[PDB]
Amino acid sequence: SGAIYVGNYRVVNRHLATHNDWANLVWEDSSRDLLVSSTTAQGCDTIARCDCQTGVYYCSSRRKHYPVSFSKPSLIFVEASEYYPARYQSHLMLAVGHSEPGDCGGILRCQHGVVGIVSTGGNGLVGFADVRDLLWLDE
Ligand SMILES: COc1ccccc1[C@H](N)C(=O)N1CCC[C@H](C(N)=O)C1
Ligand SMILES: [Zn+2]
């Protein structure tokens, strides 16, 4: 679990969105596994606006933050899970690192701010849903 809180927005994995998220919906995209809802209080996270390929992510199944090198956002085939059939997920970046299903939502960040959140994993890989192209999150 986990979310990004920027301005009056809450960014979560679409597959983990709550009923309150759907009832206060701003935008959602199943192909990216992202959903954004509106919040009453203002958030403290800042979104990175860069092309960094190194950063640090939070792994809840280890209570640890790990530094990683990650690929550029791309269209990647993701195997069938209990939340989605086997499909191509877009705007996804891969890194070598530990992940388990409940790790989705953990933040990946670089020197400029938040880059994205954990969305996929398995076999010593972790995939992050990028949010750096969503310029409207800052307005
Ligand atoms: C962090 O997730 C994992 C980590 C290790 C092993 C396996 C997993 C998950 N079975 C996983 O990859 N997904 C399940 C949740 C939906 C994901 C998606 N965005 O399509 C795919
Ligand atoms: Zn950066």
Side-chain angles (χ1 to χ4, degrees):
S1 67
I4 304 168
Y5 291 98
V6 50
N8 289 265
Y9 297 123
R10 164 171 144 99
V11 187
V12 293
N13 294 92
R14 188 184 186 274
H15 75 269
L16 299 179
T18 69
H19 168 77
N20 186 77
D21 288 322
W22 283 99
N24 293 282
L25 184 63
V26 170
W27 169 85
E28 52 85 20
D29 183 330
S30 168
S31 73
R32 293 178 68 149
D33 184 39
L34 287 181
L35 183 142
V36 177
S37 58
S38 60
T39 61
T40 58
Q42 288 215 268
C44 296
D45 295 320
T46 285
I47 307 300
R49 301 296 178 197
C50 67
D51 62 348
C52 285
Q53 285 189 251
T54 67
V56 171
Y57 80 104
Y58 182 59
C59 178
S60 72
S61 62
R62 293 284 181 272
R63 286 191 191 104
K64 222 200 186 316
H65 293 263
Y66 292 103
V68 285
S69 292
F70 55 93
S71 68
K72 293 193 170 187
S74 328
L75 190 60
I76 294 177
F77 192 71
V78 180
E79 293 303 318
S81 67
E82 61 202 76
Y83 296 100
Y84 293 108
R87 85 217 197 280
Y88 281 89
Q89 182 163 320
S90 66
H91 299 265
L92 186 61
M93 301 171 293
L94 295 182
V96 173
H98 185 71
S99 61
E100 289 167 38
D103 287 323
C104 287
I107 284 172
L108 169 67
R109 63 184 76 229
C110 64
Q111 65 181 109
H112 308 102
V114 173
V115 173
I117 52 172
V118 175
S119 179
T120 76
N123 294 311
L125 295 169
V126 57
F128 308 94
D130 186 40
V131 298
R132 293 176 290 185
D133 66 311
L134 303 177
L135 315 180
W136 53 269
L137 288 177
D138 320 311
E139 56 187 40

